[PDB]
From a paper:
Bacteria are under constant threat of invasion by bacteriophages (phages) and other mobile genetic elements (MGEs). Among the many protection strategies employed against these invaders, the highly diverse [name]-Cas systems stand out as the only known adaptive immune systems in bacteria.
Author numbering:
A (entry chain A), B (entry chain B): 2 to 116
Write the structure that this text describes.
């Protein structure tokens, strides 16, 4: 539904324009129409957003591994996209947002430091 | 630091303009300055952001209570601010975003449905 689509997008920290370009391959206006509720949300886009959410879960699982190993992780929080891309040259703006989503969660809940 | 400030802000699903107006009581430019890293984040702003994160934890704890009572919660995802305000007339735009952040988490991670 429109509500599930927006929920996942925001949890993954994607701006509408970023989700539209990279996941929907549609204009931002088209993506807004999907989230507005005045349109059918196509099921394929919803499925691709759930696939991307599984990437966030994989990234969380890796941090959980460090925690089980006794480490208090120091996670890079990239305020600047360009710095993320410099350190992660095989990723893009969507990877940057997923990194923010994961680092912010672990920090805010008291489980990791940000660097 | 600027990284912690932006991380909490984004996790709570607040736009810069919303955080600036209601939490900082400053302009978006000033809030962006605090998120830039150029100087230290003010003590009172830091504390208020931590306190709002605690409100989010309290909201999660209330849902955890319902799960422990055997409910499968149907959480209302408010894509429309005014609908949230009508249902929660003592709250404002910041409370709306907190509601989105909690509903999106429990939905995307499989514990609740959205309506």
């Amino acid at each position: 539904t429109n509500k599930e689509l927006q929920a996942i997008r925001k949890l993954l920290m994607l701006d509408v324009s970023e989700a539209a370009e990279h996941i929907g391959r549609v204009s931002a206006r088209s993506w807004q129409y999907w989230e507005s509720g005045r349109s059918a949300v196509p099921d394929d886009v919803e499925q691709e957003m759930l696939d991307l959410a599984s990437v966030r879960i994989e990234m969380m699982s890796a941090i959980d591994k460090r925690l089980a190993d006794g480490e208090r992780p120091k996670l890079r929080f990239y305020n600047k996209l360009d710095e993320y891309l410099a350190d992660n040259p095989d990723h893009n703006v969507i990877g940057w947002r997923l990194s923010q989503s994961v680092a912010a969660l672990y920090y805010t809940e008291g489980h990791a430091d940000l660097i």
